[PDB]
C-alpha cells in the first residue's frame, strides 16, 4: 500500500528520463 | 466534458492507447489501423509502440516492480492505477516523456495481463488511463497539439546511439 511511493518514483524518474534524453536528441 | 470540450482529443487518446496496448498484449503488429483517432491516431501509434516500448527497455526492472505492487486482478484495477497516477503525477511534471511512460507501464502490465488470459480488464485499462489523463491535463494536451505534437517531437529516433 504505502511502499508504492518508492514504485511510483521509478515511474516518475522513468518518464522524466525519457523527455530527458528525448529532448536533447532533438535540440 | 467536465471543462470544456476536452473529450476531441479524448476520442482519439482512448483508442490510440488502446490499439497500442492491444498490439503490446499480443506481441504482433495486429491491431488494426485506427480510423477513429484519425491521421493523429496512425502517427501517434507508430510513435507509442517505438517509443512506448523503448521505455520499457531500459528500464523493465522497475515496471516488474511494480507489477508485483499493483494489485490487478478485479474490476479495482482500474482503481489501483488511478491510484498510482495520481501519485506519478504529484510533483506535477507533465512532461510529454512522462505520459509516454504512463502508456509504457499500462502496456507491460497489459501484456502480462494477456497471458494471465484478464483481457476483459486491457481493454478498459487504456480507457482509465487515457480518461483520468485528459480530465487532468486538458490544457496540458492542447499546449503540443494533442497527440500530433507528441508525434512530431517523439517521432524521431535517437541521434546519439543508445
New interface residues.
Given amino acids: 500500500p504505502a511502499?508504492?511511493?518508492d514504485?511510483?518514483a521509478?515511474?516518475?524518474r522513468?518518464?522524466?528520463?525519457?523527455?530527458?534524453?528525448?529532448?536533447?536528441?532533438?535540440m | 466534458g467536465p471543462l470544456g470540450s476536452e473529450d476531441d482529443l479524448y476520442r482519439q487518446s482512448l483508442e490510440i492507447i488502446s490499439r497500442y496496448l492491444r498490439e503490446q498484449a499480443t506481441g504482433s503488429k495486429d491491431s488494426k489501423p485506427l480510423g477513429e483517432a484519425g491521421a493523429a491516431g496512425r502517427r501517434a501509434l507508430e510513435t507509442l509502440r517505438r517509443?512506448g516500448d523503448?521505455?520499457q527497455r531500459?528500464?523493465e526492472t522497475?515496471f516488474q516492480?511494480?507489477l508485483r505492487?499493483l494489485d490487478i486482478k478485479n474490476e479495482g484495477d482500474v482503481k489501483s492505477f488511478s491510484?498510482?497516477m495520481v501519485?506519478?503525477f504529484k510533483?506535477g511534471?507533465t512532461?510529454?516523456?512522462?505520459?509516454?511512460?504512463?502508456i509504457?507501464?499500462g502496456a507491460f502490465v497489459a501484456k502480462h495481463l494477456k497471458s494471465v488470459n484478464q483481457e476483459s480488464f486491457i481493454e478498459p485499462l487504456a480507457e482509465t488511463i487515457t480518461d483520468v489523463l485528459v480530465r487532468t491535463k486538458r490544457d496540458w494536451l492542447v499546449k503540443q497539439r494533442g497527440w500530433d505534437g507528441f508525434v512530431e517531437?517523439?517521432h524521431?529516433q535517437?541521434?546519439?546511439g543508445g
Fill in positions: 511502499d508504492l511511493k514504485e511510483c521509478q515511474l516518475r522513468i518518464g522524466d528520463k525519457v523527455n530527458l534524453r528525448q529532448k536533447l536528441l532533438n | 517509443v523503448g521505455v531500459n528500464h522497475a516492480g511494480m505492487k491510484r498510482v501519485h506519478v510533483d511534471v512532461n510529454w516523456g512522462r505520459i509516454v511512460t504512463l509504457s507501464f517531437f517523439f524521431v535517437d541521434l546519439e
